[PDB]
Amino acid sequence: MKQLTILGSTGSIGCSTLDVVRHNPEHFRVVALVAGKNVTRMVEQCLEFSPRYAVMDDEASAKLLKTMLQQQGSRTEVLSGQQAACDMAALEDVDQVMAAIVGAAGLLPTLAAIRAGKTILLANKESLVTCGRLFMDAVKQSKAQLLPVDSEHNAIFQSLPQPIQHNLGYADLEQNGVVSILLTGSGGPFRETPLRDLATMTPDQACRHPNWSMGRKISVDSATMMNKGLEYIEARWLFNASASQMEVLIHPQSVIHSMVRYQDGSVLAQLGEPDMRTPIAHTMAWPNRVNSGVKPLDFCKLSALTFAAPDYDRYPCLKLAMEAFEQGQAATTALNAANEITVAAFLAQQIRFTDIAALNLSVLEKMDMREPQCVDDVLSVDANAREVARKEVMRLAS
Amino acid sequence: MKQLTILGSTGSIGCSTLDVVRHNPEHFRVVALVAGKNVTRMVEQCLEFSPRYAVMDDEASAKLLKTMLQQQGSRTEVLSGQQAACDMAALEDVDQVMAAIVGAAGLLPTLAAIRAGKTILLANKESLVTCGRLFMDAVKQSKAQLLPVDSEHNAIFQSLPQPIQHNLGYADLEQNGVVSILLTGSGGPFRETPLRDLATMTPDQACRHPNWSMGRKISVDSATMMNKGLEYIEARWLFNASASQMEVLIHPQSVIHSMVRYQDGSVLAQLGEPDMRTPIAHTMAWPNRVNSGVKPLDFCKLSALTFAAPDYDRYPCLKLAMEAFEQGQAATTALNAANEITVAAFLAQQIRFTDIAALNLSVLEKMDMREPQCVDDVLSVDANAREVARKEVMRLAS
């Protein structure tokens, strides 16, 4: 029986996680839930899973949640604030922590889960893009077990050897028969449009906080393969791989989610339906399995599997991301920050598509910052880079 | 440092095994070699790997080998006979035993390797088709570690969880997250013709004892998918899977060598070049890896990956093999024996292609034997079935 804390229970990953709990009330039990302002949804989950505690963004929200739960017979106790989240991640009884809170707000709470040595279900992969060094170091110390939730990372993890799985982050690939990691993907035709996505979003698989403004940034990051690059930066930290132990492959149908190349010629891969309950069910039941309510992949109703090396010429960002990794976390944090701004600039037609990679590049060159020492320097580099990218994006719009 | 005995060192699998030893003289050391009448080749390997002992088919051969080795300064000692082979498989210093001796001659020596609790590199998969119960039972007792050498089995094994890998044969799939095993293949167009094979056989990768008469039986067994069925019977013993935990998929390009379906929706697969040094290098270095001198699979120079459920109507044998498994090892041994005879009958145009499945079927029905208790009853059922299939094949040719 595994007890767990969910950081960001009112997002896509959150409800997905709970549904795995729902189908397996005999293997899991929510100890605490953490969210932002979504009171209504929070109440639902508390009534259904009877968590010990529940944390919201601010007290105004905590109070409302505290009232509704009260006038509805709920033993759950309510708290609020960032520190309370961090404390929820370190509770003694907690075995796993689903780190599904994106952005800065997710850094400290996630770091505290590691500090405490909890099994960490990494679902905010974007945090390794900036605090890769910090998180991975802290992991090495507490021996906290990392289990990637993202689709490709989880595929790689599932395809690696036991010794590397049990010591994710600080093990050695050469010593364990691993020649390279094959990060797969598809972007250009950037897999699917945010338009076709909205059209096929069913009435229950929409726990994902709306924000249409985001699905657009994602598709742009997918057209420039900047998303592949962040996956690259991330993959290198998690698996502790070198530039020469990484291989990027374009795979259109997305059936194979990523693979691992071995010394004897063998290559291991994980395949499956695009449902996020598979990766999630995997990390939660590791090192065993559980049903996630996902359909078995049907090999008869599939399209041909294709592969191709990316054309680093049509997609400068991917090469730019791979290059920043070599320049350290200051470079990666900067690259990420500038991209946020330049992509927004492009959507707001202030610049052209092609200027994204250009501006991103110019920004990295104009900056000269040191390697972030803690979550606070990362944020400093972040904010510092967002400023330059802005002073730049306007000097062009003129 | 792993010391090993090779049973059948002058065949395709044998030299392949030694080449893995050749590239890794720091991880392996041949303790003894076993072969038949190929004196010349035996001498080569003894001079190159300095085995402690060498065993041949009969003394005439042992004497010749003993002379040539002698008049060429070889400390290796020579023996002959079946019992000597069995003794070579049970030597204290031996860590692994490459069981690459096909047919009846391979049963006892392989059984003795298991009895002794050696790590068994199963390369004569056809032995599980008749003594599945015997071998698997004996394995369970000595805790001998089985490591399948065949392409699909090794792919499945590599794609299974640790607990099942470390206890191959007697573990439970349900309990370890495994829903089913996906045995892949291709036969009709039966992959490649023995004609196109001869044409592309290079001057060094021809350690395979000639016998063109065999490559033909293989292609016929591939056109009737009787080979898929034996893979099925075998796969069930090794992985201890039920009829419902087996799925047969047709996969033309043979890049994916087989896969495993999991409870959470994940499916694991192993891919690679068709070279037998990969599976071999894997079983020898398990649970770690070693270089096998096989080229890394190039995903850029591949053809589209296709899958399809087999049409059990066009290929009765596959359905027949799956059905015999349910009837026990008497049925499977019989099915195999009759097939030998009927396929030979077809090549010798005494019957038609379509009569193979028919005759195979009639034979199973006309027989009523008990479950083989030991290697001797299996041989009895075998010989008993070969006789019927003959009395039948001639009543038709009339």
UniProtKB/Swiss-Prot annotation, chains A, B:
GO terms, molecular function: 1-deoxy-D-xylulose-5-phosphate reductoisomerase activity; identical protein binding; manganese ion binding; NADPH binding
Variant or mutagenesis effect after changing residue 209 to Q: Increase in KM for substrate. Reduces activity 5000-fold
Catalytic activity annotation: 2-C-methyl-D-erythritol 4-phosphate + NADP(+) = 1-deoxy-D-xylulose 5-phosphate + NADPH + H(+)
Record keywords: Cobalt, Isoprene biosynthesis, Magnesium, Manganese, Metal-binding, NADP, Oxidoreductase
Annotated binding of NADPH, by residue: 10-13, 36-38, 124, 126, 215
Any Pfam family matching the protein: DXP_reductoisom
Effect of mutating residue 231 to K: No effect on KM for substrate. Reduces activity by over 99.9%
Thermal dependence of catalysis: Optimum temperature is 40-60 degrees Celsius.
BP-aspect Gene Ontology terms: isopentenyl diphosphate biosynthetic process, methylerythritol 4-phosphate pathway; isopentenyl diphosphate biosynthetic process, methylerythritol 4-phosphate pathway involved in terpenoid biosynthetic process
Activity-pH dependence: Optimum pH is 7.0-8.5.
SUPFAM superfamilies on file: 1-deoxy-D-xylulose-5-phosphate reductoisomerase, C-terminal domain, Glyceraldehyde-3-phosphate dehydrogenase-like, C-terminal domain, NAD(P)-binding Rossmann-fold domains
EC number: 1.1.1.267
Keyword Acyltransferase part of the UniProt annotation: no
Entry binding sites for 1-deoxy-D-xylulose 5-phosphate: 125, 151-152, 186, 209, 222, 227-228, 231
Family statement drawn from the similarity comment of this UniProt entry: Belongs to the DXR family.
UniProt protein name: 1-deoxy-D-xylulose 5-phosphate reductoisomerase
